[PDB]
Subunit: 326 residues, 4 copies
């Protein structure tokens, strides 16, 4: 029945758009379809391996990182829709050339889940979009806006299937990719997260580095005090996968500050904020433990932040702990 293209246009029409938010999104889709095709046979393309470098953020860069990165930089460019790009792979903001330039700023993780490539676990692409504020010549500053300024945010999951999840002012919609005809077919319209789930998702390899609240919280999931059943544990290793499972099954996902990462691991611009926006749009929350993610005015484009998100009741139960303690 409904293709992403169609849905795009019908929702962008009713909002009276110029078509520019549109070109952009459709450009992004092609990017996703291309990445997804490569991923489904990346080992047959010798795309596992290193490309040979370290990130601005520290990552040991893989070829897939590269390919998928170029693709997005390409497709966003040719869209005539954007003016500033912030990529995980790129040290500095990318300023579109003047003739190809649009009024949009786009932050993205071209391939989230690097630790999961070689072993063929789920991985994905995350992106956010803000409308340009400044009249300034477009600079790196036009990215340093908080999450509450996002006009669109989503991510693609190359899981058992390839899914494109997309949130805007009015809600979250999931579209799945039909490899056969190369289109994204709406699978879930206007998705909402459960008020409470029963899955906690965290790398407990940092049990020792964790703070007193995370510690108390986990213990409560494992030793429920109302003597209810203990939450299930899940941690795929790929932010896009865990966030998504949290989305459809409910529960909570966690990458908290620890004694070593005052500011957690995940990046504000291109992992944290879009995931938060999606999530709030579905009716769940997203906190550092101490403040909403979407309210944080970034000062650095590669800056990290902690992140608690998911079922509102769960996220709340833990905000309470953080209070109980600080």
């Amino acid at each position: 029945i409904v293709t992403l293209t169609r849905f795009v246009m019908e929702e962008g029409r009713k909002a009276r758009g110029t078509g520019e938010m549109t070109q952009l999104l459709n450009s992004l889709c092609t990017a996703v379809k291309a990445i997804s095709t490569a991923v489904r046979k990346a080992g047959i393309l010798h795309l596992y391996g290193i490309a040979g470098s370290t990130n601005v953020t520290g990552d040991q860069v893989k070829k897939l990182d590269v390919l998928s990165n170029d693709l997005v930089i390409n497709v966003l460019k040719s869209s005539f829709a954007t003016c500033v790009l912030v990529s995980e792979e790129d040290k500095n903001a990318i300023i579109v050339e003047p003739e190809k330039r649009g009024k949009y700023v786009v932050c993205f993780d071209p391939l989230d889940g690097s630790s999961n490539i070689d072993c063929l676990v789920s991985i994905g692409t995350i992106f956010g979009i803000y409308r340009k504020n400044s009249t300034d010549e477009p600079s790196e500053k036009d990215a340093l806006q908080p999450g509450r300024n996002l006009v669109a945010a989503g991510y693609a999951l190359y899981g058992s299937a390839t899914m494109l999840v997309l949130a805007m002012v009015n809600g979250v919609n999931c579209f799945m990719l039909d490899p056969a005809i190369g289109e994204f077919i709406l699978v879930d319209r206007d998705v909402k997260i459960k008020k409470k789930g029963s899955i906690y998702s965290i790398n407990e390899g940092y049990a020792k580095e964790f703070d007193p609240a995370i510690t108390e919280y986990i213990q409560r999931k494992k030793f429920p005090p109302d003597n209810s059943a203990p939450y299930g544990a899940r941690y795929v290793g790929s932010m896009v996968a865990d966030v998504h499972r949290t989305l459809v099954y409910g529960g909570i996902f966690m990458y908290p500050a620890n004694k070593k990462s005052p500011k957690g691991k995940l990046r504000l611009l291109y992992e944290c904020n879009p995931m938060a926006y999606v999530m709030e749009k579905a009716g769940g929350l997203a906190t550092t433990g101490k403040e909403a993610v979407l309210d944080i005015v970034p000062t650095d484009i590669h800056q990290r932040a902690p992140i608690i998100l998911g079922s509102p009741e769960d996220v709340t139960e833990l905000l309470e702990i953080y209070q109980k303690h600080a």
Copy 2:
């Protein structure tokens, strides 16, 4: 360069086979390719949902369970290669009809990872094969052989890519599926597992139900006593995915007996034993905590067992704990 077909035949030729081990395997591949195609667009085929029943083992059965099941039952049948089939989905052994019958017994999880379907996490298919012993009319007994009798074992992963991993007397080989031409192209020849890794994989939602060894072991992964770095934690939720990551990255995977499941959760016939065989063939171990999995003469086809597997040094470190305690 090398397709599964080719590799099959060249290795089956050198062993002087009848071609029967062969027909069988190739039949299995088609099964896998079909399952994989459906999975990559299962939501677009309305294959998420329930089919409407409970298993012999307890599972809330999904349509994918069904489809994928029928397919294997079909393809194994038409192969002329098998005589007894044991399926997760099927209460009783399936006895091939006499004209289509072969000298092989095939146990399989048609779709492992049901809790992970809806959220699009990795899932897969696991299978084992034994040569028929009895001259008896083929009965359910011809399945009740221990794991050290396996002639072939492997599984397919529908992860970010679709992989077909296969172990026989001589070693483990990975083949990836190229959707484009619908063939399985050898990606890794004669794979070996690291002697020690740094990932422990377990549902810690049962922290409370766990025994003293598992408990002590996890604590050691989190609080290394040689003050080394603490292992990373991973738990996809899908046996096929976690086993596989263990395979290529090293580390350990765990689904131990607990105060509620004297005998763990996973089934001996079609989850545990094939995974153990693969794993031992790669150079790692697979234990109940108390005995090798492959040495356990099953008495029931749907019987469960605990299972510790992975890097030999890790699996050993924990066997020691189990000793230290019992």
Copy 3:
């Protein structure tokens, strides 16, 4: 490098469009991709057979006719771009409903080449587009415009490859479909036809029904009077295929009036005019034998016309004969 999407937008941007010519075209592409996927496995979908009816024009209707028809009617509708549709399969004009209506009229052969389906020869889709003139409530009349009013025209070939050929005021571009990622990649930019070729393409099964000019002309192709080599003969059976080969190799294609079809066989609205427009835009001609096709004000939507098209020198050589005789 360039996708149809991209090329669409960049050429529609420079013309200052509303995006409406655009939505429409992209809708058409999805239609084509869908038709093409089905065709590449139509026998495996039991799509060879009859659907069970006769056309307004006389055709024994096949299921593919139907499927492909519905698809276009669907996709053109949802585009918000059109107001009147004329289909080969549909007796009367189709008037889009008011809320979904646009300012465009679209005539199309949903699946050209029915005699060639069962035997797996090339087949295709042809379409034309005019901008609405009347302020009249959109009626069937808004289709009864001549070919020189076309704003866009092309067709898709499902040949050995799937090609999308598209002509507008500024020229003809070919895009090929990459099944892998489901996009149309520009293969030939701004195509031109040779001034003269060496292939004549005609159903000589009507040798007897043919007029004196066609007869004289064919004889000249077979017995060249400058004692040059005789033209090659080609006649696939599928208008889309023969027109296209004429396009890229040069030569001439013919479906002339005969003693039985005062007005030839092919339909003006949806076979003849778009093929003529493409062809003139490439630098060749298209004549009834007596008048340009694009100058013919249709009076009936299912009306036929003769059609000579291809290399300008050839088409001219034959216009001369038609003169020499009448």
Copy 4:
């Protein structure tokens, strides 16, 4: 229901085979699937163009010629099934190396229809297979057997769909390729040709070079003397396509000797004989005009012959003319 693999094995089983006729055939299929994938996007792979050479037989060699050739040479080799290969592209017989050698001789047109590549018309692959006679070290002679010695013959059509047609002692079966899962699904079981059709297929560009019988025959198709309707004319340009349409619709296909090609154009080994074998197995005929094709002991591997084939009544009507005249 039935895959080529399955059908292969079940028919090869009942004949009590070694599996060697089998390996071979399945190797051939992969070859076909690979060629077909490339063809469906050959322009996107820059595979239109010249590779840069002339054949033993005269052809201006295209890259597709090359790719597809290598593939077959590869796959036939690795099959362990063959000992001599005769290719259109290869001047001399190819003698498999001793360790990879089998008891089979395989002649093939790796890509029939070169004049049709660039314009995206249907093209294909033709092949024949004979069992080795000599005890001689395998030489070029083991190919110089007549057509009545063929054990298997068929061809693949990359038309609107990709079809694999295959004849053996017991009859002709068509299998279509489902791109989706990369398998060949039986579409027509044990096919038969009509006793008479109404389509004559010939390059009438040689009207002038033709002999008195062909001339008289064509005139009869166009001016039926029983005043019946005149046959339809078809000539795709691609032997594989015209032969196939003849197969399923009935009628006749013609590439006769002419004043310039005492021996017609098509090659005996790899175009003519397999097409003849298929055709006779369906219940039609195949003649030079003067003698069955399958009875001709070749003396040269690249030798040509005329060829009339199709509906037995038609082929007969024309054999009579050839008599009437000589």
